[PDB]
């Protein structure tokens, strides 16, 4: 079920990444990407996209939010430690509240 919800979410993200790229639209922004669990649409630089937490796991709260920063240079925020593109899922776990 959960595996199904994830591969399905993933396949669609990529279908769009591949078949519905931002055309022309000059300026800077963050291009659509699959962070591994959630798909994120193209957004203008200096923005903070957000969504509800994936219904994937049971210790996750669908009511909680998920965040992802796209900076002014039009590049998705990378977490400083490994310096890989990063989505903030720190608020999804029920027991951390």
């Amino acid at each position: 079920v959960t595996r199904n919800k994830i591969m399905t979410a993933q396949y669609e993200c990529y279908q769009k990444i591949m078949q519905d790229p931002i055309q022309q639209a000059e300026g800077v922004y963050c291009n659509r990407t699959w962070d591994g669990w959630l798909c994120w649409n193209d957004v203008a630089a200096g923005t903070e996209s957000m969504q509800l937490c994936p219904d994937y796991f049971q210790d996750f709260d669908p009511s909680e939010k998920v965040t992802k920063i796209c900076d002014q240079d039009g590049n998705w925020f990378r977490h400083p430690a490994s310096n890989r593109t990063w989505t903030n899922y720190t608020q999804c776990n029920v027991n951390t509240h």
Binding site: R3, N4, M7, T8, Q10, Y11, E12, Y14, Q15, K16, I17, M18, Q19, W34, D35, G36, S82, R84
Partner: protein, 79 residues
């Protein structure tokens, strides 16, 4: 052991995924028919990424997932 690095790890995954998909050219746009090789390809690419201590997603992995979407799914809808 054919996996000697992430490069070869990805080839291993890619070739095993291709072996699973070739016999079903007609069913490529059918989730019931592809969900397993596809889901199994994700697992392979991510499990070896862990094995070489790389994150997931990672560039080399996505390039491969980009590949299947080009050669296998470019003709299907978003389902």
């Amino acid at each position: 052991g054919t996996v000697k690095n992430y490069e070869t790890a990805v080839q291993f995954c890619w070739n095993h995924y291709k072996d699973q998909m070739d016999p079903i050219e007609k069913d490529w746009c059918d989730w019931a028919m592809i969900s397993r090789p596809y889901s199994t390809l994700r697992d392979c690419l991510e499990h070896f990424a862990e094995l070489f201590d790389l994150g997931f997603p990672n560039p080399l992995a996505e390039r491969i997932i980009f590949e299947t979407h080009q050669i296998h799914f470019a003709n299907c809808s978003l389902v």
